[PDB]
Design a protein that fits this description.
1 chains; about 70 residues; little secondary structure; 1 helix; about 0% strand; RNA-binding; pre-crRNA processing endonuclease
Length: about 70
RNA sequence: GGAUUGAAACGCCAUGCUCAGGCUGGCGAGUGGGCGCCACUCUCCAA
């Protein structure tokens, strides 16, 4: 009908929670705002809007720690 | 061609495991035992 299905994957990710920003801690899954951000990176013009509907999670949850200057 | 609580963000500069110490002193392969018993070169061939 209309709308699209897109797949994305990678090895690292960090969607920082607003209330633990100085010491970054990530959500368990990507919030809709990040999805908004990614789609606009392929094509976007001032004349249109993006509307997100769903997200599918296909892997288990894992965590790791890193420190930097 | 606005805005992924985002856009930028070195763990970095440098320091001897060093100085020295005996595997030593010493102890019998040593005591002793028959190669023995006995047996035909012997029968015949002109120079």
């Amino acid at each position: 009908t209309y709308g699209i299905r897109l797949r994305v994957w990678g090895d690292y990710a960090c969607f920082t929670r607003p209330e633990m920003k100085v010491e970054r801690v990530s959500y368990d899954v990507m919030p809709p705002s990040a999805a908004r951000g990614i789609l606009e990176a392929i094509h976007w013009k001032p004349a249109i809007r993006w509307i997100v509907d769903r997200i599918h999670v296909l892997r288990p949850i894992v965590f790791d720690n890193v420190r930097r200057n």
